[PDB]
Write a protein that binds this ligand. Structure first.
Ligand SMILES: *CCC(=O)N1CC2(CC(n3nc(C4CCCCC4)c(-c4c(C)ccc5[nH]ncc45)c3C)C2)C1
Ligand SMILES: Nc1nc2c(ncn2[C@@H]2O[C@H](COP(=O)(O)OP(=O)(O)O)[C@@H](O)[C@H]2O)c(=O)[nH]1
Ligand SMILES: [Mg+2]
Ligand SMILES: [Mg+2]
Length: 168
């Protein structure tokens, strides 16, 4: 068995907590306290290998902190989450990624770009725009809906596969 320390990053209101809770416990949270930052664990079987996902759902303040750098440095892989109906959250991805590259002191950190809220028709971020951004970073792009659970397992398992390719 292998342990994977994952970190979920993205602006307030993109669905980091909803995605994390859908993954760990299979239910959709309509509202979840934006101040609650916690780690959640779930044992899953990925590609026949038993894996333990230790997932840090970031929250709190959008400020620089050396203590936050310590928690980020423990992450092996990062889910970069934006909402497909919130262009600012998509534009913020570049800035969260820059902070992670700084803390990890590497240009090759395992990451997956996640376009959440795919069930909504009020889309403002084109699939082509998000695919182009993910290609520019050399990382996978996955569209998810924490509401219907579509793409949720794929998002986290894809990040685990990225960590495996990086370790090898
Ligand atoms: C509504 C609460 C919520 O859900 N939040 C997610 C969160 C934004 C997130 N966050 N912001 C930053 C920095 C982005 C650039 C300006 C300073 C804040 C980070 C971050 C990262 C990704 C890496 C290292 C680091 N060190 N200090 C801050 C960071 C994060 C995780 C928190 C508010
Ligand atoms: N329709 C829809 N709403 C979502 C989805 N994910 C989150 N939400 C809603 O968006 C809001 C913010 O979600 P939350 O998990 O609190 O975002 P966080 O601030 O990134 O942790 C909540 O009202 C959620 O119910 C989704 O995939 N589809
Ligand atoms: Mg913002
Ligand atoms: Mg949250």
């Amino acid at each position: 068995m292998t342990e994977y320390k994952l970190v979920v990053v993205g602006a307030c209101g993109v669905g980091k907590s909803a995605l994390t809770i859908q993954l760990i416990q299979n239910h959709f949270v309509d509202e979840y306290d934006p101040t609650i930052e916690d780690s959640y664990r779930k044992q899953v079987v990925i590609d026949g290998e038993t894996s333990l996902l230790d997932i840090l759902d970031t929250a709190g303040q959008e400020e620089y902190s050396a203590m936050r750098d310590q928690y980020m440095r423990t992450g092996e892989g990062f889910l970069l989450v934006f909402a497909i109906n919130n262009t600012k959250s998509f534009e913020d991805i570049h800035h969260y990624r820059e902070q992670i590259k700084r803390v990890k002191d590497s240009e090759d950190v395992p990451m997956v770009l996640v376009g959440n809220k795919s069930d909504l028709p009020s889309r403002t971020v084109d699939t082509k725009q998000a695919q182009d951004l993910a290609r520019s970073y050399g990382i996978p792009f996955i569209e998810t809906s924490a509401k219907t659970r579509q793409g949720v397992d794929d998002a986290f398992y894809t990040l685990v596969r990225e960590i495996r390719k990086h370790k090898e």
